[PDB]
Amino acid sequence: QQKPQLVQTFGRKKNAVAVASVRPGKGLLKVNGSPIDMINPQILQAKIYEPILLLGQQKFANLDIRIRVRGSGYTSQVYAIRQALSKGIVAYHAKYVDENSKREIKEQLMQYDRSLLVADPRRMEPKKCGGRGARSKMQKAYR
Amino acid sequence: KKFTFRGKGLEELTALASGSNSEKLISDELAALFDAKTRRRVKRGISEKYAKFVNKVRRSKEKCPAGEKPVPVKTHYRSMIVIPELVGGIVGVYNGKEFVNVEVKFDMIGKYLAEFAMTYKPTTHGKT
Amino acid sequence: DKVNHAVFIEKKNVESIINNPSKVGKVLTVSTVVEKLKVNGSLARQLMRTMADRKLVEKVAKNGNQWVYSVIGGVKEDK
Amino acid sequence: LVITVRKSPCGEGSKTWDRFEMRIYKRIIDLTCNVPDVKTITNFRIDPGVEIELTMTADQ
Amino acid sequence: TTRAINKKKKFVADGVFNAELHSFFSKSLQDAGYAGIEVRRTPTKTEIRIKATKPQQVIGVEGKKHKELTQFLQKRFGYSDDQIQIWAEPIKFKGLCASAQVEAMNYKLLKDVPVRLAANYIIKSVIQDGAKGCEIIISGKLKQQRAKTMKFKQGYMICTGQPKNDYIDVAVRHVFFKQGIMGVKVKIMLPY
Amino acid sequence: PNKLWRTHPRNYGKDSKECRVCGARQGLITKYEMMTCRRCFREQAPHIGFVKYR
Amino acid sequence: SFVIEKESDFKYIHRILNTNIDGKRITPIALTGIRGIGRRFAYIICKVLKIDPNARAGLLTEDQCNKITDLIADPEAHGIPTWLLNRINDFKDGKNYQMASNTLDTKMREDLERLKKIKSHRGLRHFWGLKVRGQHTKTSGRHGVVCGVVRKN
Amino acid sequence: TQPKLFGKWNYDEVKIQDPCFQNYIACTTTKSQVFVPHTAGRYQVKKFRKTQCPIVERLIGTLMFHGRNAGKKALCIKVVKNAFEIIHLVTGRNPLEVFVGAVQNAGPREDSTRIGTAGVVRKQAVDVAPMRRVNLAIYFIIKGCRESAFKSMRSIAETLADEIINAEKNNTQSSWAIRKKDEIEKVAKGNR
Amino acid sequence: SNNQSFFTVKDVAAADFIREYASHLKKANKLSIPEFTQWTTTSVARELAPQDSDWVYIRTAALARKVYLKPHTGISTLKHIFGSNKDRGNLRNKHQACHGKILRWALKSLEDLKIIRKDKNSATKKFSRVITKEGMTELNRIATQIAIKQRQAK
RNA sequence: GCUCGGCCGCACGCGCGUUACAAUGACUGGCGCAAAAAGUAUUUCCUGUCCUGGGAAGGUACGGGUAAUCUUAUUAAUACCAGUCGUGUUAGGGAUAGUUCUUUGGAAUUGUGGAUCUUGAACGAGGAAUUUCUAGUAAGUGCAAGUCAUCAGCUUGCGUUGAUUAU
Numbered sequence A: 001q002q003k004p005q006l007v008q009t010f011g012r013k014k015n016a017v018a019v020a021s022v023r024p025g026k027g028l029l030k031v032n033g034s035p036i037d038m039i040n041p042q043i044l045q046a047k048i049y050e051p052i053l054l055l056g057q058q059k060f061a062n063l064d065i066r067i068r069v070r071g072s073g074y075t076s077q078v079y080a081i082r083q084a085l086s087k088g089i090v091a092y093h094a095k096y097v098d099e100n101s102k103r104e105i106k107e108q109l110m111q112y113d114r115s116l117l118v119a120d121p122r123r124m125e126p127k128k129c130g131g132r133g134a135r136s137k138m139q140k141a142y143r
Numbered sequence B: 001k002k003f004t005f006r007g008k009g010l011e012e013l014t015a016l017a018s019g020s021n022s023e024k025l026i027s028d029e030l031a032a033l034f035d036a037k038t039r040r041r042v043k044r045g046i047s048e049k050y051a052k053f054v055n056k057v058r059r060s061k062e063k064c065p066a067g068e069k070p071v072p073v074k075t076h077y078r079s080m081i082v083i084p085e086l087v088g089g090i091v092g093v094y095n096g097k098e099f100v101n102v103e104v105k106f107d108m109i110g111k112y113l114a115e116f117a118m119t120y121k122p123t124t125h126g127k128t
Numbered sequence C: 001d002k003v004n005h006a007v008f009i010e011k012k013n014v015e016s017i018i019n020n021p022s023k024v025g026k027v028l029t030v031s032t033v034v035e036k037l038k039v040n041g042s043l044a045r046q047l048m049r050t051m052a053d054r055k056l057v058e059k060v061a062k063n064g065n066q067w068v069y070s071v072i073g074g075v076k077e078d079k
Numbered sequence D: 001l002v003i004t005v006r007k008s009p010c011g012e013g014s015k016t017w018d019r020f021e022m023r024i025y026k027r028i029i030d031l032t033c034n035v036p037d038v039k040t041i042t043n044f045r046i047d048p049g050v051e052i053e054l055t056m057t058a059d060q
Numbered sequence E: 001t002t003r004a005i006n007k008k009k010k011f012v013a014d015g016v017f018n019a020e021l022h023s024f025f026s027k028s029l030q031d032a033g034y035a036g037i038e039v040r041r042t043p044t045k046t047e048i049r050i051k052a053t054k055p056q057q058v059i060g061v062e063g064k065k066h067k068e069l070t071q072f073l074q075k076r077f078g079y080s081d082d083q084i085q086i087w088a089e090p091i092k093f094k095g096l097c098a099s100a101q102v103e104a105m106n107y108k109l110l111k112d113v114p115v116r117l118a119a120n121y122i123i124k125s126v127i128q129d130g131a132k133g134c135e136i137i138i139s140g141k142l143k144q145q146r147a148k149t150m151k152f153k154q155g156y157m158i159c160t161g162q163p164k165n166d167y168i169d170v171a172v173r174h175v176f177f178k179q180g181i182m183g184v185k186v187k188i189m190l191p192y
Numbered sequence F: 001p002n003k004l005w006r007t008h009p010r011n012y013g014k015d016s017k018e019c020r021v022c023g024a025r026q027g028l029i030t031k032y033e034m035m036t037c038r039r040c041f042r043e044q045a046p047h048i049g050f051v052k053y054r
Numbered sequence G: 001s002f003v004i005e006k007e008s009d010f011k012y013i014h015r016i017l018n019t020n021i022d023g024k025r026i027t028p029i030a031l032t033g034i035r036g037i038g039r040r041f042a043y044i045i046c047k048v049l050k051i052d053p054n055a056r057a058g059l060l061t062e063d064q065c066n067k068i069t070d071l072i073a074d075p076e077a078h079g080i081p082t083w084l085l086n087r088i089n090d091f092k093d094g095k096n097y098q099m100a101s102n103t104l105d106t107k108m109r110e111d112l113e114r115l116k117k118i119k120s121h122r123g124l125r126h127f128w129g130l131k132v133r134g135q136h137t138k139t140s141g142r143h144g145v146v147c148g149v150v151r152k153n
Numbered sequence H: 001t002q003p004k005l006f007g008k009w010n011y012d013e014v015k016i017q018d019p020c021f022q023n024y025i026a027c028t029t030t031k032s033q034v035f036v037p038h039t040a041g042r043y044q045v046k047k048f049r050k051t052q053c054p055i056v057e058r059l060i061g062t063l064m065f066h067g068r069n070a071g072k073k074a075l076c077i078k079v080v081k082n083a084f085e086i087i088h089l090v091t092g093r094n095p096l097e098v099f100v101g102a103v104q105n106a107g108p109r110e111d112s113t114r115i116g117t118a119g120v121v122r123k124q125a126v127d128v129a130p131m132r133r134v135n136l137a138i139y140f141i142i143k144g145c146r147e148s149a150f151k152s153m154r155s156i157a158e159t160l161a162d163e164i165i166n167a168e169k170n171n172t173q174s175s176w177a178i179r180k181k182d183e184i185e186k187v188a189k190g191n192r
Numbered sequence I: 001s002n003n004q005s006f007f008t009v010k011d012v013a014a015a016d017f018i019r020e021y022a023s024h025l026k027k028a029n030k031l032s033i034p035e036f037t038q039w040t041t042t043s044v045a046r047e048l049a050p051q052d053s054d055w056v057y058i059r060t061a062a063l064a065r066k067v068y069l070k071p072h073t074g075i076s077t078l079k080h081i082f083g084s085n086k087d088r089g090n091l092r093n094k095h096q097a098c099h100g101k102i103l104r105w106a107l108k109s110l111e112d113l114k115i116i117r118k119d120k121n122s123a124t125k126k127f128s129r130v131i132t133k134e135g136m137t138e139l140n141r142i143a144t145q146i147a148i149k150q151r152q153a154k
Numbered sequence J: 001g002c003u004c005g006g007c008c009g010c011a012c013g014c015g016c017g018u019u020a021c022a023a024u025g026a027c028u029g030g031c032g033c034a035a036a037a038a039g040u041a042u043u044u045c046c047u048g049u050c051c052u053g054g055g056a057a058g059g060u061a062c063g064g065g066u067a068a069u070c071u072u073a074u075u076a077a078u079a080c081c082a083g084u085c086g087u088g089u090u091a092g093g094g095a096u097a098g099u100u101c102u103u104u105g106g107a108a109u110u111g112u113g114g115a116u117c118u119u120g121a122a123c124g125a126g127g128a129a130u131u132u133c134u135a136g137u138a139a140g141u142g143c144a145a146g147u148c149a150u151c152a153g154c155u156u157g158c159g160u161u162g163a164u165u166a167u
């Protein structure tokens, strides 16, 4: 079967899931089969470029990384991509490099943001009856 | 003064509706000129009963040539659409308490018979 | 009140307004231009574009309602 | 299966609701065998609420 | 196969079958203490175990009530004679069954035996059979034309929590009098 | 000559159905094809196998 | 365009079909100023008569204006689909006309009159100053509010 | 490489002086230097967490208001960046230095409150905390923005820029934030 | 030089692709542009007929792109992809689907240009449209032209 | 039981609420972002292709699914990108009306819903009063389920975008 040089990490925010696959070579980032350039709301593309700029391109020119994302809505999706990418490099440096590098990129990243290696525990709140929402309730008449 | 429906006269309409070999009460030529809800009621079916009804009008319409007005025909069919062959007759339409006598005019063919007998009384107020 | 904002500019004034964008200010938007030249916003935009094609003016940002442009040599003092 | 039902048989003013659940668990098991072995493996007591469905695809 | 049915729609239908049975048996079996019903379903058969205090009255005089029942289910659903099977199973401890005990006080109250005495008799029985605790509620006109509600507790009792659904056994009955319907609940907390 | 009895179409709408138990037409629960009014359902619910976890 | 060479030729007030037309404005939505013309029809009128829809109303040619009055006169003769008209096939005549400034108020007045005369429910209802479509008079419409046949002023 | 805000604005050029604010305004930290103002942070789970939130994100938060605009963040990120551009076009220095400058420079210090002591009820002269000082600063600035931009042609980016500049300049005419600040501080001085 | 001679549609911002391929369809004058085009708005959900006279081109261009990407995407699904919200007035905004005839015209006419085929071999969705070798080549060369014009900008 | 009305009748008083008063906007394009629910006693239930119609909708041409297999792992809408419109009862806002067309139903008139042209009111942010609410929370935003032949401005749920301020 010839076990590949693959690493596979996942990342999560709300209902969104990102699976990033990392293999060695000339660095690509393709999300859902397309460059980061084309990710829908333009503003938060910089969110995905963040861990890249934080680690420096030097780590990323050595690796082709392809991230498929399926999930909730635009923003959470962006955050999932972020996550998967980040802990993806970490997992690579775990299997194929020394542990030391894994450690120092871990610290490197988390000093900037912890949302990269750790997932946002928040999810939606179910709705309580007698309201238009998960707390707020039908208006009341006292007098 | 004239009386016109979709560019046709009572003579003309009676010429389409009494048109030879059309055994439906309301023939297709006429039904093409109807508003959508009527065309719908016709093409979808109809009941045999209405035939008898129209017949009564036929009998009441020719039975008062001298001009004393027709002998009124009582019926419960509100959902009935007016055929030109009923124009000039007087028909009792049940409003649920009562039989409202309605005299037919050329302008009223397209509409349902119910559209005339008042189902209710209007509102005339007082408290203060 | 109402603000009558001109819906046409005379062929007498046109490139006289165009060639000298600094009458509007250090910052050109729809609003600025509307204020300074009493031109209705759509034509204000059209002016922006014309004098942008003309190398006189540059885009800083575009967000659906917001035009932000600056003058090339800098603000050049009037008359 | 959820059925959300209003408690009071009447309109009695506060609205209260009942979240009524029925869970259905569905399992699949696949075997490579002959008929008698099947009838051997099905030979044991099962609790009442269980539905057991058997299908046989021949294989060469 | 018969018909392909929605696993959801089938299962709900099975539950509704079960409930119809329970209503049928609690209603037509009312003299012998009737507790429960357990239904196994075979492509061949439908097996019903009637769990009861007095199996002897489920059977009757050489299957008078048994044959009656079996045939009732037969005409009702339609069934082959090999397709229906009814067993009666004894409940070894009558003191741990509520529906039974509420049937007991139904009985005792019909014979005009006074409230407190009857309540005590059953409660003492229930605890005699090893139940940790029991309670009885009788509601409705007792004294007079104005409704009363009387509770009788002895032993250990839980109300609230998931343990409620586990340890506590409850049954109600409507009891009929010339004056109207009075009604009776029995809560037996079971032992561990 | 009862011929006219019940001869209005009950084909659909409110009169096509009823609670199997109590024969109510009102607030009938049709959702799993269980044909039980809200009250009757609320009663049978544990016998039908409907738990309240929630 | 913005630039017009002679300020002398621009018509602020234009007049088409017994109605004023606002000049400083975009031509079709300026044409909305007529009873019987809403935005989509005006955009159509611009597409048939090849008039610039991005242009102003002051830039209007009199030729064009007469052509528009003509469009309104015999719209179906100018092309355009029948299904696009305010009046599909009139009760009196089977013809398809589209409703002008005056002609509209006329035909509506006529219709309602024959509805009084007919003594139909809804015609009576109109006469009475009530709601025609059969909605609820218990709650809304209070202290008087516009009933059918709305007139802008 | 040190990230610049929006890529064009260097955080290293912002230095806070007044010792109250240095712990209360985000931008000093590695964690607060962000290309994008959008964290999706948890800033509200504990009492002072709000402090660790980037100031521009805070401002963006305040912007998102009124029923129609609720929960549209992208809009406000746009508005803010644009306003910042107009700011650098007017002043020519880091739109951050202007912002931070104008959060510091406009917000109340003294404020008056009812303190019941036995019989005494009347306004009393009270001093404002750093956190509230900041919060209020932003609240005010943006409220002025809305009131002005409402039916005008001036956009929010514009109104907001105007306000930020006037707010740092201390202008009591042109800055709503300072109008209220001075009004409040005067009410307060009068209530001692 | 390893700067790629070749670029997929997936490497290109979709807006650009659409305006470009529409341009190509005009220059080619390769489209029919039916008569109902003049008097009809996009969807039932819209108050105003489209502001661009070229919409038929643009819409067709984009359509091809969709078919390039999502193969076997039938008309209804496209009516939904190409639909929107519609104000019903004082009733809450609700989802609404596009017109059919325009989309099916665009697919008929794209078969005509050999850029899509009706698959007779899919036994689920039969006669669903899938791009051809030819159409693929064409779109990928537009895409490439675009992407190179982009990396030419420093 | 059957037929026709009635509960929807309007000078008004009082409650829940939907929609707005617009530029943080409306409109015209472009854009491979959800979750959770349902579903055929065989043509009847979800419905995918396909074809016709300008449209709502119709064919019946080829088909799947009693469903983790099929509708679908999609088809949502805020959001984003272009472009129009330019602070005025303006395209904001659409009540109310008149023709036409369609669909559910023996039956639609006292408009069941939906479509096309028209028609365009009040409303320029709301007196005394007063409701609910502390984090994926409020608010906006759509989606399902119940009802149900047809009829959501309701209810019960589902996610998306995401706060100000307390503690």
Ligand SMILES: [Mg+2]
Pocket (backbone or CB within 6 Å): none
């Ligand atoms: Mg809502």
Ligand SMILES: [Mg+2]
Pocket (backbone or CB within 6 Å): I084
């Ligand atoms: Mg849109």
Ligand SMILES: [Mg+2]
Pocket (backbone or CB within 6 Å): none
């Ligand atoms: Mg169909």
Ligand SMILES: [Mg+2]
Pocket (backbone or CB within 6 Å): none
């Ligand atoms: Mg569905």
Ligand SMILES: [Mg+2]
Pocket (backbone or CB within 6 Å): J111
């Ligand atoms: Mg009507």
Ligand SMILES: [Mg+2]
Pocket (backbone or CB within 6 Å): none
């Ligand atoms: Mg309506």
Ligand SMILES: [Mg+2]
Pocket (backbone or CB within 6 Å): none
């Ligand atoms: Mg339905």
Ligand SMILES: [Mg+2]
Pocket (backbone or CB within 6 Å): J154, J155
């Ligand atoms: Mg209700």
Ligand SMILES: [Zn+2]
Pocket (backbone or CB within 6 Å): F019, F020, F021, F022, F023, F024, F036, F037, F038, F039, F040, F041
């Ligand atoms: Zn019932």
